[PDB]
Amino acid sequence: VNSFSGYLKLTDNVYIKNADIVEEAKKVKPTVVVNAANVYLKHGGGVAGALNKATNNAMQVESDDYIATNGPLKVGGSCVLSGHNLAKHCLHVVGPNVNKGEDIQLLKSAYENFNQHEVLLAPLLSAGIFGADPIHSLRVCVDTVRTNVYLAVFDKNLYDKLVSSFL
Numbered sequence: 001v002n003s004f005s006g007y008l009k010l011t012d013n014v015y016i017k018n019a020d021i022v023e024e025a026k027k028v029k030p031t032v033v034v035n036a037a038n039v040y041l042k043h044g045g046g047v048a049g050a051l052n053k054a055t056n057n058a059m060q061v062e063s064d065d066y067i068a069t070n071g072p073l074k075v076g077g078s079c080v081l082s083g084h085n086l087a088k089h090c091l092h093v094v095g096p097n098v099n100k101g102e103d104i105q106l107l108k109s110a111y112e113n114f115n116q117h118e119v120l121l122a123p124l125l126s127a128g129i130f131g132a133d134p135i136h137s138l139r140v141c142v143d144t145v146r147t148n149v150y151l152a153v154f155d156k157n158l159y160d161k162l163v164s165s166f167l
């Protein structure tokens with residue numbers, strides 16, 4: 001048993017809810033929250049901007065030190081940093097950004113990072129301002145992630161479309 005509430009079960013391991021991931025993280029304090037990161041860990045907008053704002057910019061301060069030491073992530077890659085006030089850990093995962101012309105085949109590689117963690121609270125990778133089709137992102141998630149993933153979908157309209165179109 002875990003503390004996640006109100007989720008619809010899609011598969012053995014994947015769960016979904018219409019929720020603000022920031023508010024969900026604050027309530028649950030999961031072991032791992034996933035950030036929709038870019039390779040520079042510049043948390044300006046989308047899910048990353050919202051998570052970073054909720055940490056009072058401490059996520060960005062930690063991230064800048066990480067980049068100064070290690071250099072940028074790979075598209076499809078990840079790093080584990082603090083979860084600050086939201087979670088124990090934040091898994092910063094870089095899905096391909098269609099609005100920058102990145103290979104959508106890298107979305108599967110991105111989701112493979114989730115398999116290193118037994119339970120995660122996550123957004124749909126490459127959705128929102130990253131420009132991918134969220135229906136596609138959910139299919140790749142279900143067909144790639146084997147650990148237990150709790151997906152938060154901010155937009156109620158999109159949530160209902162994801163559920164009603166799910167195969």
Ligand SMILES: c1cc(C2CCNCC2)n[nH]1
Pocket residue numbers: 070
């Ligand atoms: C040597 C050092 C590492 C670090 C692992 C923790 N954070 C990123 C770099 N990998 N290989």
